[PDB]
Amino acid sequence: LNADRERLMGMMSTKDEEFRRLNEEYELDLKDAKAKYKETHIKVETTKA
Amino acid sequence: LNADRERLMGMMSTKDEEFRRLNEEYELDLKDAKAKYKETHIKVETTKA
Amino acid sequence: SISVDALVQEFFAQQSLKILPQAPFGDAVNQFVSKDDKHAVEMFVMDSLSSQVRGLLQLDDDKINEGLDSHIEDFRKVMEKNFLS
């Protein structure tokens, strides 16, 4: 049972590092991304009309 | 040294957890990354020339 | 005995343009021949598109995702009722 307990110790210990790094790339990609699709699309239908 | 061994094994398990997702992504990433620029660029110069 | 400008003005009535307003459109095309502005109507069309995109950006995301085919002529009537001023 102790072994099982430190199993989850290590699981969260490394999953936290994975989570923070993935959050870093998420912040970068969110700054790069926003929601610019609708801006692209709206001019498209405006021009076609 | 007990807690040391289970820390090592938990590192192993979380590492196996992490590597598989990156391999799965890299399959599709490598499938479509290399070719497209090769044709695109040369046609750009060709046409503008 | 009928002016060509009068002819185009009256013939702009049968149909309603998808986004352009019909009455200011006739006004601009008539102005083309009236004051001899050889390059007139493109200012009108660019102003119309710039106003239309700005107006549509003011709406919520739910409204635009649900539809866009109706809001364009809604703002078109907005444009004509502005043109009277």
Swiss-Prot record, chains A, B:
It is found in: Nucleus; Chromosome. It comes from the Eukaryota. Component of the MRN complex composed of two heterodimers RAD50 and MRE11 associated with a single NBS1. Belongs to the SMC family. RAD50 subfamily. The zinc-hook, which separates the large intramolecular coiled coil regions, contains 2 Cys residues that coordinate one molecule of zinc with the help of the 2 Cys residues of the zinc-hook of another RAD50 molecule, thereby forming a V-shaped homodimer. The two heads of the homodimer, which constitute the ATP-binding domain, interact with the MRE11 homodimer. Component of the MRN complex, which plays a central role in double-strand break (DSB) repair, DNA recombination, maintenance of telomere integrity and meiosis. The MRN complex is involved in the repair of DNA double-strand breaks (DSBs) via homologous recombination (HR), an error-free mechanism which primarily occurs during S and G2 phases. The complex (1) mediates the end resection of damaged DNA, which generates proper single-stranded DNA, a key initial steps in HR, and is (2) required for the recruitment of other repair factors and efficient activation of ATM and ATR upon DNA damage. This is DNA repair protein RAD50. The lineage of its organism: Eukaryota, Fungi, Dikarya, Ascomycota, Pezizomycotina.
Swiss-Prot record, chain C:
It is found in: Nucleus; Chromosome, Telomere; Chromosome. It comes from the Eukaryota. Core component of the MRN complex, which plays a central role in double-strand break (DSB) repair, DNA recombination, maintenance of telomere integrity and meiosis. The MRN complex is involved in the repair of DNA double-strand breaks (DSBs) via homologous recombination (HR), an error-free mechanism which primarily occurs during S and G2 phases. The complex (1) mediates the end resection of damaged DNA, which generates proper single-stranded DNA, a key initial steps in HR, and is (2) required for the recruitment of other repair factors and efficient activation of ATM and ATR upon DNA damage. Component of the MRN complex composed of two heterodimers RAD50 and MRE11 associated with a single NBS1. Belongs to the MRE11/RAD32 family. This is Double-strand break repair protein MRE11. The chain holds residues 438 to 522 of 730 of the full protein.
